[PDB]
Amino acid sequence: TLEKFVDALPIPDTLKPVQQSKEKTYYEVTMEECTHQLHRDLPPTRLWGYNGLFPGPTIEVKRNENVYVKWMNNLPSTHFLPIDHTIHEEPEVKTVVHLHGGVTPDDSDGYPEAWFSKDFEQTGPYFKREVYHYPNQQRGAILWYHDHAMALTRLNVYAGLVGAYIIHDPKEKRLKLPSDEYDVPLLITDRTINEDGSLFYPSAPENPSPSLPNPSIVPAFCGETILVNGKVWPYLEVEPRKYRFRVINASNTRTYNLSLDNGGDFIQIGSDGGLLPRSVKLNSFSLAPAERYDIIIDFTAYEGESIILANSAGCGGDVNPETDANIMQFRVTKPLAQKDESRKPKYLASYPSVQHERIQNIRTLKLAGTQDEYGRPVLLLNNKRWHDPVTETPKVGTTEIWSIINPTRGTHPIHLHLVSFRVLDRRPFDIARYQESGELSYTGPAVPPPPSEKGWKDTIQAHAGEVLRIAATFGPYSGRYVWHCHILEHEDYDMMRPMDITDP
Ligand SMILES: [Cu+]
Ligand SMILES: [Cu+]
Ligand SMILES: [Cu+]
Ligand SMILES: [Cu+]
């Protein structure tokens, strides 16, 4: 229904520090209930936002900048979305901020049980500090921050609690990539919106078996509408030149498969973990929840054109050409402000291969689940609940191969905190046999990663009927972290596990 391409794409302002010196940068971000218009033709929407903004302000830091952010909850004491009480005396509204892809001390990582309520009145069992510490001793990259509170993540994020966080490495400046105004984040979230403009989040699955509690969690969420940077199907006026985009899938469930309707190419220059070693010319790319693509789009040859960023991946069905087949629209009509001095270099960074690592351990992990007393699917990593004693206990400074078995019907974007990792390969196997006997026979050879996945990843798509192998060096910090599916509906029930990085 909503008319496509009638609102300009908002560019979230960069957060200004409360105090800053050479030794440290200090920010304050408070979560607020606020209203914002999401489309020219809608009444304002009630949202929860970092500093009352949706998306939250973009935070920009340098490699090794010593940063502190005091994340504060100043939200209402009751939620506005359907809470399922059967899945977890504590406050109804709990929040904790996770800097996804951050190389972070464990008590600044936004552990699900380090949640806090309004003004920190009550705090979860794993809470230690108000002011998070981000030393940012990691590669230049696109991070994003979002809520991570136990049993509430799918809800708090859907409410609007997402933002971008960029680490700039000054040594990457020589590459001369598009920058400043020509470097633009795109946070993509699908939403379903009611006529009065309020957010809709389902309080039960369709055909609620009379067994189900009310509200009941749902296995997956697909929105009828795509937003980018907080506007339904927006347009961006661009100059006819090279642009850099930080593409972030900030949606609960939905996977995008992006292309340009004029047949133009993306130049991939970066993955979750930063610059790829070599740029990759791409015609389409898959982007599952929490994945990030750092791309250049060359508008030089398309002056005057309107180009749709299009999507082909279904979400609980085929794309509707009028709705979710559309993400946004570029209009190459802005006059040049100056000569395009930016570059699209082939040679970007050292290969991850350059470093030789002793494999200390090899974990086999399965994506499984069971069914609760109401008949619902309960998703589990290794048939273990979140509350079960920890089993993933890598040693600090060591490298493991994780071997992720997926006998389910769907893809799972598996995310590991603290570390970025590389991809080894994927291999199809007999699902019926694995389920019958617990034994694994591969039905075809190993497939190494495409160039897209030959850098550093931290969220990785594990396709159905495959075994995915990744290699991660755990460090530099020890402590209590998490690994989980990043489909929020899965994560909350109950596809999330503790991870202890140990000291010897
Ligand atoms: Cu995340
Ligand atoms: Cu994360
Ligand atoms: Cu999942
Ligand atoms: Cu997480």
Swiss-Prot record:
The record marks 109, 491 as: Plays a crucial role in the protonation steps. One of its GO terms (molecular function) is copper ion binding. Cu cation 3 binds at residues 148, 417, 484. Inhibited by azide. GO terms for biological process: sporulation resulting in formation of a cellular spore. Belongs to the multicopper oxidase family. This is Laccase. The gene is cotA.
